[PDB]
Amino acid sequence: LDPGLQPGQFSADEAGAQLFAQSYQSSAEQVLFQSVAASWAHDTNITAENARRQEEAALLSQEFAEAWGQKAKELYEPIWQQFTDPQLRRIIGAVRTLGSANLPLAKRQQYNALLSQMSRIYSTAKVCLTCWSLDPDLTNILASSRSYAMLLFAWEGWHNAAGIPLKPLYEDFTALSNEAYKQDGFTDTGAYWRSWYNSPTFEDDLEHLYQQLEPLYLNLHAFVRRALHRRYGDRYINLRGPIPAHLLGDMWAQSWENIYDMVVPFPDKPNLDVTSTMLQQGWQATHMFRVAEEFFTSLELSPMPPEFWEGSMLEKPADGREVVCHASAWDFYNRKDFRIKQCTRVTMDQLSTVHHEMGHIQYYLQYKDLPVSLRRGANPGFHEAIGDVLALSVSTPEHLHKIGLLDRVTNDTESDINYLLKMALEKIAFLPFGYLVDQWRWGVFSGRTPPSRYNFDWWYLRTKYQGICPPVTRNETHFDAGAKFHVPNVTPYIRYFVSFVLQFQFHEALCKEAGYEGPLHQCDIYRSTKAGAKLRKVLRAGSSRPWQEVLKDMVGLDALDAQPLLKYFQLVTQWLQEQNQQNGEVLGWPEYQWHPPLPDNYPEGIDLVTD
Ligand SMILES: *[C@@H]1O[C@H](CO[C@@H]2O[C@@H](C)[C@@H](O)[C@@H](O)[C@@H]2O)[C@@H](O[C@@H]2O[C@H](CO)[C@@H](O[C@@H]3O[C@H](CO)[C@@H](O)[C@H](O)[C@@H]3O)[C@H](O)[C@H]2NC(C)=O)[C@H](O)[C@H]1NC(C)=O
Ligand SMILES: *[C@@H]1O[C@H](CO)[C@@H](O[C@@H]2O[C@H](CO)[C@@H](O)[C@H](O)[C@H]2NC(C)=O)[C@H](O)[C@H]1NC(C)=O
Ligand SMILES: *[C@@H]1O[C@H](CO[C@@H]2O[C@@H](C)[C@@H](O)[C@@H](O)[C@@H]2O)[C@@H](O)[C@H](O)[C@H]1NC(C)=O
Ligand SMILES: CC(C)[C@H](N)C(=O)O
Ligand SMILES: [Ca+2]
Ligand SMILES: [Cl-]
Ligand SMILES: [Zn+2]
Numbered sequence: 001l002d003p004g005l006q007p008g009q010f011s012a013d014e015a016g017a018q019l020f021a022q023s024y025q026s027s028a029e030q031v032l033f034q035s036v037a038a039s040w041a042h043d044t045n046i047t048a049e050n051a052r053r054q055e056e057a058a059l060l061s062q063e064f065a066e067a068w069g070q071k072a073k074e075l076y077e078p079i080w081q082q083f084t085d086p087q088l089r090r091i092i093g094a095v096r097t098l099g100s101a102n103l104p105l106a107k108r109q110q111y112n113a114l115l116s117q118m119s120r121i122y123s124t125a126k127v128c129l130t131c132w133s134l135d136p137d138l139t140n141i142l143a144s145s146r147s148y149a150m151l152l153f154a155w156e157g158w159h160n161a162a163g164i165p166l167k168p169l170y171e172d173f174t175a176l177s178n179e180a181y182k183q184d185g186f187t188d189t190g191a192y193w194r195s196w197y198n199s200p201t202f203e204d205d206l207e208h209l210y211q212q213l214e215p216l217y218l219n220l221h222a223f224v225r226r227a228l229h230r231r232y233g234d235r236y237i238n239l240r241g242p243i244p245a246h247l248l249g250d251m252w253a254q255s256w257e258n259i260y261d262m263v264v265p266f267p268d269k270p271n272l273d274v275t276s277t278m279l280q281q282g283w284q285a286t287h288m289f290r291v292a293e294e295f296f297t298s299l300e301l302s303p304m305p306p307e308f309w310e311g312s313m314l315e316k317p318a319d320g321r322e323v324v325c326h327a328s329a330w331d332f333y334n335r336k337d338f339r340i341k342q343c344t345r346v347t348m349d350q351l352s353t354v355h356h357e358m359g360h361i362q363y364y365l366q367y368k369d370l371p372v373s374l375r376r377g378a379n380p381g382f383h384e385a386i387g388d389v390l391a392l393s394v395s396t397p398e399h400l401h402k403i404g405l406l407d408r409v410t411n412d413t414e415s416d417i418n419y420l421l422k423m424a425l426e427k428i429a430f431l432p433f434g435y436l437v438d439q440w441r442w443g444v445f446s447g448r449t450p451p452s453r454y455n456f457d458w459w460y461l462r463t464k465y466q467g468i469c470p471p472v473t474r475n476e477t478h479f480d481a482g483a484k485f486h487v488p489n490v491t492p493y494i495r496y497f498v499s500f501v502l503q504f505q506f507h508e509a510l511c512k513e514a515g516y517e518g519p520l521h522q523c524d525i526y527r528s529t530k531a532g533a534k535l536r537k538v539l540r541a542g543s544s545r546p547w548q549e550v551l552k553d554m555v556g557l558d559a560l561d562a563q564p565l566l567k568y569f570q571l572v573t574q575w576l577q578e579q580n581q582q583n584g585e586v587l588g589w590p591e592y593q594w595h596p597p598l599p600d601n602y603p604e605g606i607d608l609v610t611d
Contacts, residue, residue: 001063005067006067007020010071012079014088017075017088018085021091024373027064027068028064028068029335031061032061033332036332039054041053042116043123046120046123046321054112055112058112058115065098069096072092077096087544099180100112102179102181107176114172118169118173122166122489123323124322134325136343138251139251143249148247148599150609151247152471155251160478162482162483163481164477164478164479167451167479170479177189177490178445189445193494209501213428215587216573217431218467219577219580220424220429220576221243224259225239238594240589244595248429251483252433253468254429255433257422257425257426263425264418266414269414269415270409272419273422277407278346281404285342286314288346289340295393296390298528298532299525300536301536304338308339308361311337312339314340315344324341327353327357328357329361352391352394355394363539366540367539374543374544377543378538378541378542378543378546379495379543379547381496384495385498385502386535388503389510396522402524416571417571417572419521427565428569432466433465434499435465436465437493438493441493454479458480469596473595504565505564505565508567508568510528510534511523513534520568521568521569
């Protein structure tokens with residue numbers, strides 16, 4: 001470690017710890033910057049050389065964390081918890097958490113290599129018929145094909161190509177990650193991930209939320225399954241069974257807005273998918289980002305700085321090198337550089353993604369002058385929620401009309417049901433997936449799910465929560481969890497479940513603060529400077545204060561609460577219940593063992609339905 005980056009001498013008291021923290025920050029910004037820069041250079045240009053450079057940068061970061069972590073313990077271990085400044089307590093608590101820096105050098109190098117190789121495998125996997133990439137090709141097929149066989153080929157091809165080679169690396173990764181966090185006092189890595197929520201009752205509280213939400217999912221599931229039955233027939237859809245996992249608009253069946261045009265309740269009403277209008281009007285990635293930015297500035301939040309526009313990767317490179325296309329938002333920790341890396345396509349769901357990623361950037365801009373250790377969301381769910389809150393306003397037919405994307409305007413009960421159904425496809429269908437992914441990982445990290453049950457337990461959870469089944473047979477050579485970005489890229493998932501609840505709590509509070517008095521699902525906070533100021537208060541706090549108190553200030557309650565989500569959806573929750581009863585549906589999938597058969601001459605003759 002460079003001399004300038006090494007911890008010096010500080011007194012073993014609170015006053016010294018304050019000086020230690022100031023000195024830590026100064027060097028940490030440099031070390032984080034070089035690491036983030038190196039990761040950027042890799043993710044925007046995946047090469048063995050750029051992986052090597054990123055790995056070298058990670059080792060420097062691990063040296064840094066060890067030096068400053070060991071100094072924090074040497075000086076402050078018996079006393080930091082009784083310090084009177086609560087921000088300082090959080091800074092010291094973060095600095096003394098070493099993570100992968102607890103591993104000796106040889107294991108740090110193994111750990112860092114595993115992360116690179118897992119990232120490379122996921123983001124360069126292809127399905128050959130002429131080979132399809134996940135983004136744009138397989139993504140577009142899953143969203144827009146209504147050919148059972150084409151969808152199947154894409155689903156099976158992707159899961160086999162991405163998942164199979166990840167399995168050995170993922171086992172090795174899990175062991176090293178646990179070894180690392182055990183030395184910070186956690187029984188496994190999952191316990192460390194959960195500790196960010198500072199709640200002894202986290203798992204129970206999530207489970208109690210899920211119980212309130214599940215009836216909404218069950219009704220939405222049955223209604224969609226009926227539509228799929230009438231399209232694909234009794235051979236491929238069991239009205240009392242799980243839905244084939246490839247038919248719901250998305251590679252992971254994680255949200256279903258892409259099959260809205262197959263299930264729309266009232267097809268005589270305005271077309272709420274504005275993608276074709278975006279395309280007719282000549283929208284491009286940059287316009288999508290500029291429109292998102294202008295929503296933020298309407299709330300008196302910050303525009304994107306010149307560094308964002310000059311440095312970001314807003315379209316898939318045509319040159320046409322390998323990249324991590326999975327949308328992400330980047331803080332370089334120098335208070336100047338902030339970037340989005342997205343292979344942006346011109347669709348309505350992508351416009352929401354742009355808002356999602358820009359919400360991350362807005363958080364970074366607002367807390368950039370906090371101590372480095374407090375430049376995080378109040379919890380990780382807060383970070384995920386911000387952009388989604390704005391996107392809820394943007395999605396309203398009234399807002400879409402304001403920005404020239406929805407010509408017809410209407411306020412009748414059928415149009416409301418259509419809108420709420422579209423939003424339920426996007427939000428309610430996600431809830432089980434958002435909840436199950438880290439249930440799977442937590443069991444893997446605890447040892448409850450060994451490698452010999454990776455896939456058995458994944459599909460157990462996939463069926464249990466989502467009521468879906470694989471549309472081809474799977475066995476333990478397959479590693480289908482690995483075919484989802486966040487698994488090989490080691491990004492926790494429970495944040496997204498937390499976010500999908502929290503965002504309705506936020507939306508309700510900002511709508512109230514805007515002085516809006518109509519139905520919650522027709523609120524638009526656009527141009528509300530008061531809404532803006534209430535949200536800014538949250539963003540500026542970073543992780544300086546307990547999330548329960550930040551939430552209480554914002555919404556009047558100190559806990560996650562499903563009621564705002566239930567209130568938003570009430571009309572379609574009722575309508576779906578009625579529809580399913582009239583149709584005599586069974587709610588759930590009591591034929592839990594059911595899987596669809598293969599199509600007749602699959603996969604030969606896929607050439608007849610491709611190009
Ligand atoms: C779409 O239409 C609905 C319904 O409008 C109502 O019913 C129609 C048939 C007409 O008779 C309307 O004149 C009538 O309001 C609108 O929702 C309704 O908005 C009003 C006005 O904000 C709401 O009234 C408020 O409710 C709050 C909460 O209790 C009170 O504190 C306020 O003082 C005020 O009474 C009303 O509750 C709400 N109705 C329902 C059923 O939710 C909606 O605004 C409109 N949307 C658009 C985009 O035009
Ligand atoms: C993608 O990364 C590679 C490194 O793997 C970059 O290759 C370097 O390119 C510069 C500029 O032309 C050359 O002067 C170097 O000699 C190259 N280095 C190596 C190690 O081969 C490449 O430029 C990157 N591409 C982009 C668009 O950034
Ligand atoms: C696991 O499955 C592998 C490939 O899948 C199989 O091939 C398709 C075409 C169908 O026959 C399907 O029913 C099968 O699952 C097999 O090559 C392999 O033998 C299986 N692995 C183990 C360890 O048994
Ligand atoms: C929240 C969810 C949509 C997440 N961004 C994902 O792509 O998996
Ligand atoms: Ca989608
Ligand atoms: Cl998380
Ligand atoms: Zn996010």
